[PDB]
């Protein structure tokens, strides 16, 4: 299936995560469909995490089933919140 998931890049002890859309059976670094956002765990930057919302929503609609952490991140950003 298709998942919204976090791809580790970066350095040892300096992790960086790509909030990304990809197939379930892939390398956690692998050929992903689209880069929707990015997240730094270490909170080192002011704009530490950011995801484009509309694209994410579209993906969800299509049926992109997110990872739990990813979902949390999305919620934090303001994707799942509706009015």
Partner RNA sequence: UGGAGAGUUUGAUCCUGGCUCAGGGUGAACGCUGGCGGCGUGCCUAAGACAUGCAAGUCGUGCGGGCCGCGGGGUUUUACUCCGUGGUCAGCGGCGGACGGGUGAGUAACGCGUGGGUGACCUACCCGGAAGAGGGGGACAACCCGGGGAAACUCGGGCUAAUCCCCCAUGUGGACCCGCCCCUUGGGGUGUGUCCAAAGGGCUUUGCCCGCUUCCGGAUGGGCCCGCGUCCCAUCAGCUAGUUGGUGGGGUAAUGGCCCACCAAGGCGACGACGGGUAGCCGGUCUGAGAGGAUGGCCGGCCACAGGGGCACUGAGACACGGGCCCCACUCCUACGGGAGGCAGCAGUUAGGAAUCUUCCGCAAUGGGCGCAAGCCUGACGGAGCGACGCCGCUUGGAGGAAGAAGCCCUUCGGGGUGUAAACUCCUGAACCCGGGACGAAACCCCCGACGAGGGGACUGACGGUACCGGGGUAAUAGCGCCGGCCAACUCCGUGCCAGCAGCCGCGGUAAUACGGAGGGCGCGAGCGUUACCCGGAUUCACUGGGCGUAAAGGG
Residues that bind RNA (CB under 7 A): 1-3, 5-8, 11-13, 15, 17, 23-31, 33, 41-43, 61-65, 67-72, 75-76, 78, 80-83
Q: How far is the CB of 48 from RNA (least distance, A)?
A: 10
Q: How far is the CB of 19 from RNA (least distance, A)?
A: 8
CA angle in degrees (0–180, nearest 5) for 27-79-10: 35
Query: Could you tell me how far CA 50 lies from the centroid of its own chain?
Result: 9
Q: How far is the CB of 47 from RNA (least distance, A)?
A: 15
């Amino acid at each position: 299936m298709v998942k919204i998931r976090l791809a580790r890049f970066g350095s040892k002890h300096n992790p960086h995560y790509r909030i990304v859309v990809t197939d379930a059976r892939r390398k956690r670094d692998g050929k992903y469909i689209e880069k929707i956002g990015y997240y730094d765990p270490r909170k080192t930057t002011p704009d530490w995490l950011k995801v484009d919302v509309e694209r994410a929503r579209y993906w969800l609609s299509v049926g992109a089933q997110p990872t739990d952490t990813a979902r949390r991140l999305l919620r934090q950003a303001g994707v799942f919140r509706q009015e």
